[PDB]
Amino acid sequence: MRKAYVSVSGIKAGILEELQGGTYQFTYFEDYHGAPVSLTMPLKNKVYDFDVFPPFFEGLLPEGIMLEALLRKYKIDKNDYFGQLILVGQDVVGAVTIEEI
Amino acid sequence: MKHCPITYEVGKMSVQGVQKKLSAKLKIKEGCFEIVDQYGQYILKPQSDIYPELPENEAITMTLAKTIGLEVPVHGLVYSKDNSLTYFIKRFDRIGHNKKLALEDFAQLSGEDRHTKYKSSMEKVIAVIEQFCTFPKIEFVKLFKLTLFNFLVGNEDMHLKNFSLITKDRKISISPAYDLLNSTIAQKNTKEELALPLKGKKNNLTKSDFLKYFAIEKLGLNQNVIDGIVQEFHQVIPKWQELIGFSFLSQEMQEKYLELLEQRCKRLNFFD
Ligand SMILES: [Cl-]
């Protein structure tokens, strides 16, 4: 399905993968040794599974009128959170960036 | 939107979601703002068409926070193209040379999302701080001071996404202030005093809630520390009154602001 590179301050950190059945999974690249993507996901584990869209990545999406602005710019359905993340992933709050594979 | 500074450098309930938040760059030569789609260093907040005078409200409120000693980034007002006022704030997750700092809001840190950013509590906020902050005891003092400020100035919109932890020079702490304003006077039929319950309460909060349950039993602050901070707020009320009367709020909006501030000061026995 759909996968994306997740970078921290320009250095490639891991891969966020859309899995079947609505699950998601984030996997750290073994080469990565920088700051964690988030404080809830330190480098001591490499694989994180999620039964929904992981809160951290959902927290990067716009809100309110800004979400309405995104939704009338792009041909993307509301509640396609992963698709919206790829669209804005070049520049979000913090040091994390998202780019599609 | 896109000009240069002035005198200044669904059954849910949210309020900030009726106002735009625009990215912008500071023009190096011209010293004016340029809205950009991406890669901005400032945030611009123009007038909302639903709630009135939000930029002027946010600008004075962030200045009041700076006067009591909260960490407040550079902010101010600019005239939009339609000759109205637009608020700006310098992002603290961008630090020149096009570097970034890690910044995470408490909804991300506690597993909540946008739809559930009100389904939490200040006890849960404290727990996030105790988990991740480098010096939780120092951050607890800041939280206490932030929560008292938001009560006094009628900010009833401090949901989970309005708290953030910043990672700066390997130190994790509560970020500088952002999105602070008097949302009570901006609305009509205001429903709550606190966005997240404290001791299970979102309205009719009392002195013992903040100064006993919160300050002592949940934050572990010594009595002499509490007394000093309370004294700080006492000494700043005259300065706050002056600043509000000198702000860019309309006279009617200034009066709503002062009357709310006095009502909240009186409930905490500031004038007794
Ligand atoms: Cl400490």
XYZ file of C-alpha atoms and ligand atoms in Angstrom:
374
model
C 0.000 0.000 0.000
C 1.139 3.527 0.874
C 4.419 4.124 2.708
C 6.388 7.239 3.575
C 9.889 8.165 4.661
C 9.951 9.961 8.018
C 12.879 12.326 8.540
C 14.120 14.170 11.618
C 15.800 17.504 10.839
C 16.630 16.331 7.314
C 18.123 12.969 8.329
C 16.034 9.970 7.294
C 14.747 8.326 10.480
C 12.297 5.578 9.557
C 9.321 4.428 7.521
C 5.628 4.853 8.333
C 3.646 2.151 6.534
C -0.088 1.845 5.892
C -0.950 -1.789 6.645
C -4.068 -3.796 5.864
C -7.107 -3.649 8.111
C -6.557 0.000 9.013
C -3.453 -0.714 11.093
C -0.284 1.352 10.793
C 3.340 0.685 11.676
C 6.444 2.840 12.066
C 9.907 1.272 11.810
C 13.174 2.993 12.698
C 16.044 2.600 10.268
C 18.812 0.686 12.031
C 21.260 3.331 10.792
C 19.318 6.089 12.579
C 20.806 7.225 15.887
C 19.579 10.829 16.159
C 16.831 12.319 18.270
C 13.608 10.274 18.352
C 10.752 11.149 16.020
C 8.733 11.769 19.167
C 9.152 11.383 22.900
C 6.633 8.513 22.892
C 8.844 6.588 20.428
C 12.448 6.399 21.598
C 15.143 4.485 19.775
C 15.149 1.612 22.288
C 12.375 0.015 20.224
C 12.567 -0.143 16.433
C 8.996 -1.143 15.484
C 5.781 0.537 16.637
C 2.344 -0.764 15.684
C -0.868 1.258 15.809
C -4.492 0.176 15.514
C -5.385 3.698 14.316
C -3.464 6.580 12.785
C -0.649 7.162 15.329
C -1.523 10.221 17.449
C 1.887 11.814 16.875
C 1.412 11.935 13.113
C -2.244 12.942 13.423
C -1.013 15.837 15.578
C 0.769 17.301 12.540
C -2.417 17.822 10.509
C -4.120 21.237 10.276
C -7.232 22.201 12.213
C -10.278 24.402 11.902
C -10.329 26.800 8.984
C -6.782 25.760 8.031
C -8.022 22.206 7.497
C -10.888 23.603 5.411
C -8.256 25.441 3.348
C -6.264 22.251 2.771
C -9.403 20.348 1.766
C -10.406 22.866 -0.910
C -6.859 23.063 -2.297
C -6.271 19.320 -2.702
C -8.404 16.552 -4.193
C -8.370 14.440 -1.048
C -11.158 13.085 1.112
C -11.595 14.271 4.676
C -10.535 11.533 7.175
C -7.808 10.337 4.771
C -5.294 11.431 7.378
C -2.330 9.609 5.834
C -3.036 11.182 2.446
C -3.262 14.622 4.047
C 0.021 14.050 5.890
C 1.878 13.320 2.643
C 0.429 16.516 1.157
C 1.693 18.754 3.995
C 4.640 16.562 5.018
C 7.324 18.836 3.565
C 6.759 21.428 6.325
C 5.003 20.752 9.654
C 5.471 21.877 13.244
C 8.616 20.500 14.846
C 11.604 18.851 13.194
C 9.839 15.951 11.422
C 9.144 15.698 7.678
C 7.135 13.120 5.708
C 7.723 12.115 2.072
C 5.929 9.409 0.111
C 7.662 6.366 -1.341
C -1.810 39.703 6.317
C 1.369 40.628 4.398
C 2.582 43.937 5.712
C 4.933 45.389 8.287
C 4.873 45.876 12.065
C 3.319 48.781 13.955
C 3.964 49.994 17.549
C 4.365 46.243 18.172
C 7.819 44.721 17.426
C -20.363 18.393 15.671
C -21.198 18.903 19.347
C -17.783 20.285 20.307
C -16.826 23.789 21.418
C -13.507 25.068 20.024
C -12.856 28.750 19.337
C -9.382 29.005 17.778
C -10.730 27.068 14.780
C -12.511 30.109 13.328
C -9.270 32.035 12.686
C -6.611 31.412 10.062
C -2.989 30.622 10.942
C -0.745 31.649 8.035
C 2.928 30.909 7.456
C 5.119 33.868 6.589
C 8.707 34.935 6.006
C 10.207 38.210 7.183
C 11.470 40.150 4.177
C 15.139 40.756 4.953
C 15.497 44.128 3.227
C 11.978 45.559 3.401
C 11.246 44.344 6.938
C 7.709 43.294 6.009
C 5.879 39.967 6.121
C 5.222 37.735 3.103
C 2.636 34.950 3.480
C 4.047 31.766 2.008
C 2.513 28.342 1.620
C 5.542 26.545 3.089
C 8.900 27.169 4.770
C 7.896 30.154 6.887
C 9.450 31.363 10.133
C 6.493 33.407 11.448
C 2.797 32.756 11.978
C 0.246 35.410 11.026
C -3.291 35.409 12.430
C -5.628 37.838 10.637
C -9.080 38.908 11.767
C -11.733 36.239 12.155
C -15.135 36.666 10.533
C -16.898 34.886 13.425
C -15.327 36.233 16.644
C -14.224 39.872 16.952
C -10.868 41.540 17.547
C -8.916 38.296 18.005
C -5.531 39.716 16.804
C -5.668 42.695 19.178
C -6.909 40.329 21.900
C -4.062 37.857 21.367
C -1.431 40.605 21.169
C -2.288 42.267 24.481
C -2.824 38.908 26.207
C 0.629 37.650 25.213
C 2.057 40.951 26.457
C 0.308 40.481 29.810
C 1.901 37.016 30.020
C 5.329 38.543 29.391
C 4.788 41.109 32.161
C 4.193 38.428 34.814
C 7.288 36.524 33.688
C 6.055 33.780 31.374
C 8.340 32.919 28.450
C 6.711 34.670 25.479
C 8.218 34.746 21.968
C 8.422 37.827 19.771
C 4.926 38.917 18.752
C 3.046 41.975 17.605
C 0.570 43.482 15.171
C 0.687 44.389 11.477
C -1.837 46.158 9.261
C -3.373 43.750 6.766
C -4.052 44.771 3.175
C -7.677 45.587 4.084
C -6.361 48.096 6.678
C -7.234 45.804 9.598
C -4.830 44.465 12.214
C -3.114 41.078 12.001
C -1.241 39.324 14.800
C 2.166 37.737 14.272
C 4.393 35.477 16.355
C 7.933 34.221 15.782
C 7.968 30.426 15.649
C 10.220 28.846 18.272
C 10.538 25.582 16.311
C 12.558 27.533 13.698
C 15.862 29.063 14.730
C 17.575 30.630 11.736
C 20.051 28.970 9.377
C 16.901 26.952 8.505
C 17.308 24.649 11.495
C 14.354 23.224 13.402
C 13.660 22.238 16.997
C 11.619 19.255 18.122
C 8.190 20.390 19.325
C 5.342 18.129 20.425
C 1.939 19.054 21.829
C 0.372 17.298 24.799
C -2.264 15.607 22.644
C 0.543 13.923 20.686
C 2.352 13.103 23.939
C -0.758 11.639 25.619
C -2.212 9.682 22.693
C -5.171 11.987 22.033
C -6.069 13.659 18.732
C -7.780 16.769 17.374
C -11.314 15.534 18.089
C -10.399 14.527 21.666
C -8.054 17.390 22.591
C -10.522 18.386 25.335
C -10.947 14.871 26.793
C -8.214 15.149 29.416
C -7.444 16.957 32.691
C -4.825 19.145 34.314
C -3.844 16.131 36.401
C -3.059 14.367 33.109
C -1.132 17.447 31.943
C 1.016 17.268 35.094
C 1.750 13.593 34.412
C 3.015 14.386 30.909
C 5.372 16.989 32.384
C 6.657 14.599 35.059
C 7.370 11.998 32.369
C 9.234 13.960 29.713
C 10.556 17.283 31.053
C 14.217 17.623 32.029
C 13.428 19.538 35.262
C 9.792 18.740 36.148
C 9.901 20.774 39.380
C 10.897 23.884 37.420
C 8.178 23.130 34.876
C 5.581 22.709 37.640
C 6.231 26.288 38.768
C 5.686 27.421 35.173
C 2.489 25.357 34.861
C 1.068 26.832 38.071
C 1.847 30.341 36.848
C 0.421 29.609 33.383
C -2.799 28.150 34.811
C -3.386 31.113 37.145
C -2.769 33.520 34.255
C -5.213 31.737 31.946
C -7.864 31.872 34.682
C -7.335 35.593 35.339
C -7.442 36.597 31.657
C -10.334 34.297 30.758
C -8.468 31.890 28.477
C -10.901 28.957 28.529
C -9.311 27.338 25.455
C -6.171 25.711 26.919
C -6.796 22.275 25.464
C -4.168 19.573 24.965
C -2.885 21.029 21.695
C -2.091 24.349 23.418
C 0.554 22.730 25.653
C 3.825 21.712 24.012
C 7.227 20.367 25.022
C 10.217 21.842 23.195
C 13.575 20.090 22.899
C 16.203 22.834 22.939
C 19.915 22.238 23.547
C 19.137 18.719 24.863
C 16.793 20.208 27.493
C 13.092 19.287 27.348
C 10.739 21.856 28.853
C 7.379 23.501 28.341
C 7.588 25.568 25.160
C 7.233 29.367 25.127
C 3.678 30.677 25.292
C 1.436 30.540 22.237
C -2.249 30.915 21.382
C -3.009 32.835 24.607
C -6.010 35.151 24.469
C -9.141 36.134 26.370
C -11.514 33.752 24.618
C -14.293 34.437 27.129
C -14.881 38.009 25.963
C -14.484 37.017 22.301
C -17.501 34.693 22.531
C -21.029 35.010 23.800
C -22.579 32.399 26.103
C -19.188 31.238 27.360
C -19.695 27.760 28.791
C -16.561 27.066 30.873
C -13.697 28.636 32.808
C -11.112 25.913 32.092
C -10.739 23.876 28.913
C -9.433 20.863 30.852
C -11.003 20.035 34.237
C -9.060 20.623 37.443
C -10.276 18.513 40.376
C -13.091 17.540 38.008
C -14.197 21.175 37.648
C -14.401 23.382 34.566
C -16.542 26.149 36.120
C -16.876 27.845 39.508
C -13.236 27.249 40.413
C -12.107 28.649 43.754
C -8.977 29.812 45.544
C -8.528 26.465 47.321
C -8.704 24.667 43.967
C -5.686 26.547 42.588
C -3.727 27.303 45.761
C -4.333 24.121 47.789
C -5.398 21.162 45.628
C -3.413 22.183 42.541
C -0.396 23.984 44.001
C 0.253 21.730 47.018
C -1.271 18.290 46.490
C -0.711 17.924 42.728
C 2.360 20.102 42.062
C 4.145 19.743 45.408
C 5.063 23.427 45.640
C 6.243 24.799 48.971
C 4.025 27.365 50.668
C 6.658 30.097 50.359
C 6.897 29.487 46.613
C 3.108 29.713 46.247
C 3.002 32.922 48.286
C 5.700 34.556 46.165
C 3.906 33.775 42.905
C 0.570 34.971 44.290
C 2.325 38.176 45.374
C 3.712 38.515 41.834
C 0.184 38.491 40.416
C -0.940 41.019 43.052
C 1.796 43.485 42.050
C 1.061 43.140 38.323
C -2.664 44.016 38.409
C -2.011 47.807 38.243
C 0.366 47.268 35.308
C -2.132 44.974 33.568
C -4.906 47.564 33.875
C -2.661 50.200 32.290
C -1.514 47.976 29.413
C -5.063 46.921 28.505
C -6.222 50.540 28.392
C -3.287 51.304 26.077
C -3.891 48.324 23.764
C -5.457 48.216 20.304
C -8.699 46.670 21.566
C -11.849 48.701 21.069
C -13.139 50.559 24.123
C -16.058 48.133 24.461
C -13.646 45.191 24.197
C -11.273 46.815 26.695
C -14.129 47.148 29.180
C -15.140 43.494 28.812
C -11.474 42.579 29.380
C -11.118 44.706 32.519
C -14.457 43.570 33.969
C -13.553 39.898 33.497
C -10.089 40.429 34.989
C -11.570 42.138 38.051
C -14.158 39.367 38.508
C -11.419 36.710 38.385
C -9.120 38.697 40.674
C -11.978 39.048 43.147
C -12.720 35.313 43.171
C -9.086 34.717 44.186
C -9.320 37.385 46.946
C -6.784 39.712 45.292
C -8.520 42.808 46.711
C -9.553 41.453 50.133
Cl 13.653 19.298 38.838
